[PDB]
Design a protein around this ligand. Structure first.
Ligand code: HEC
Length: 108
């Protein structure tokens, strides 16, 4: 449909350079300014254990899948108005496909 599986090798590099400053993916990995993302897919928003989210991220109550993750990552503040972060989004569709292909596996 919208998301198409791409390169997880490229996705791992995009995670280091675009997400890893604020997030970790390992099971039991620490929160940074943003939550640890282990188990994020197939879970509703605002539910990383031990992380205090904004009301906006909780109230969005989105069930994370690859298509809404790609829409969100384009511009988080446009998808969840009120979310607070020094991140504008991953604008290229190729980048989002590669990152999400990696993220689906890295957060399992
Ligand atoms: C690189 C492309 C990424 C990816 C894959 C994600 N982010 Fe972030 N993010 C940050 C903060 C502070 C939050 C919490 C915001 C709030 O409470 O309003 C988030 C939230 C997310 C989510 C939602 C998780 C959920 O449980 O609903 C997801 C899927 C996510 N991020 C993925 C902070 C940042 C950054 C701060 C410098 C950067 C950079 C990123 N995020 C980048 C990414």
């Amino acid at each position: 449909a919208e998301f198409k599986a791409g390169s997880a090798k490229k996705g791992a590099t995009l995670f280091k350079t675009r997400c890893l400053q604020c997030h970790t993916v390992e099971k039991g990995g620490p929160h940074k300014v943003g939550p640890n993302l282990h188990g994020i897919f197939g879970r509703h928003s605002g539910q990383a254990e031990g992380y205090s989210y904004t009301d906006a991220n909780i109230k969005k109550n989105v069930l994370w899948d690859e298509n809404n993750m790609s829409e969100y990552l384009t511009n988080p503040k446009k998808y969840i108005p009120g979310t607070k972060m020094a991140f504008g989004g991953l604008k290229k569709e190729k980048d989002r496909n590669d990152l999400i292909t990696y993220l689906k596996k890295a957060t399992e």
